[PDB]
Symmetry: C3
Subunit: 142 residues, 3 copies
């Protein structure tokens, strides 16, 4: 038995439409994954900045304690070791602008809001992904 023309035509039309449908749904899945990837990326950059600023915090304050100690004038025997330590600390300062040691001073800061908002308590969409399955058309004989 032969196959009806129109029938077969509509069948193949349905398969092509199924293919395009699956294709566009697939690009949507890719774009969702992509969005999540970008989120991860932002969280990482912000965490890095957080680490920089912690470096600046702790090293800055250690420097201030060292300077204060010099100024008091009670480090006599170990004064050279103190100077050297101050040198090391300045050498360990965060990758940013920071004011002189002598006395007190501010330091680096580069990460706000999402820095503390992206990673700390941030709802992360999991991975429920689906794609359609399709039925075949019954091509009827002419």
């Amino acid at each position: 038995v032969a196959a009806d023309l129109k029938s077969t035509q509509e069948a193949i039309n349905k398969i092509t439409k199924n293919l395009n449908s699956l294709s566009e749904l697939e690009v949507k899945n890719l774009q969702r994954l992509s969005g999540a990837m970008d989120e991860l990326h932002n969280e990482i950059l912000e965490l890095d900045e957080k680490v920089d600023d912690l470096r600046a915090d702790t090293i800055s304050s250690q420097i201030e304690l060292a300077v204060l100690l010099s100024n008091e004038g009670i480090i006599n025997s170990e004064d050279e070791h103190l100077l050297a330590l101050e040198r090391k600390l300045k050498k360990m300062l965060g990758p940013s602008a920071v004011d002189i040691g002598n006395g007190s001073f501010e330091t680096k800061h580069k990460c706000n809001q999402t820095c503390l908002d992206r990673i700390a308590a941030g709802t992360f969409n999991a991975g429920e992904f689906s794609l359609p399955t399709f039925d075949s058309l019954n091509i009827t004989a002419a």
Copy 2:
């Protein structure tokens, strides 16, 4: 020449089955990528916690050295600068519960096991992804 009905029917059935097969394999690929995404996410959260706890460690101990210094009574000229430094340090404490400065004290801690296990020496599945390709059926004339 016309096309055999049954033949064409089985052909289209095979194409639809190929399409569903590819579809379900594709969702599996998406779910694997998704799993890896979640892993990255966990590693990031744990690293963040690690940074918090380091902040608490270093700032806590700097505070203790400052308090000890006050208690010794040898900071006379720079005593106000010392108080101020203690204020700054308390202001820099990690985002968590920490006991009074005077004397010694504990501090923040929020990240165990995988915190040191997820990122430090953790086998990360790479990206070997594949999908099937399919053959066309020879539709035989009636």
Copy 3:
């Protein structure tokens, strides 16, 4: 009306070819996403190492200030508290090899180049993903 054999054959051939095309394009999309995933992973490992080395930096220098303070001999009343603090600090040292406290000393370091190059100013490919859509063939009657 019946459907021409050859015509239908070429139609189904085109649909199968469309399916294989979409399939291979899809694996390419997966491999691109996978590459980006690996990048994120590397950035994370490097950030972790960065955190380790900051720990070593700050804790090492706090230890040195404590030792210097002992050596000066001006911590008399609080000398036990100082010893204890040194113990705590050594207990907080980074997960790596570090030389004795007394005097000065070096410490942990495990992350170079990309450690400061991967996350700090690194162009991250976004998510422009596409897949083809296909046309259906007009099967002509015999």
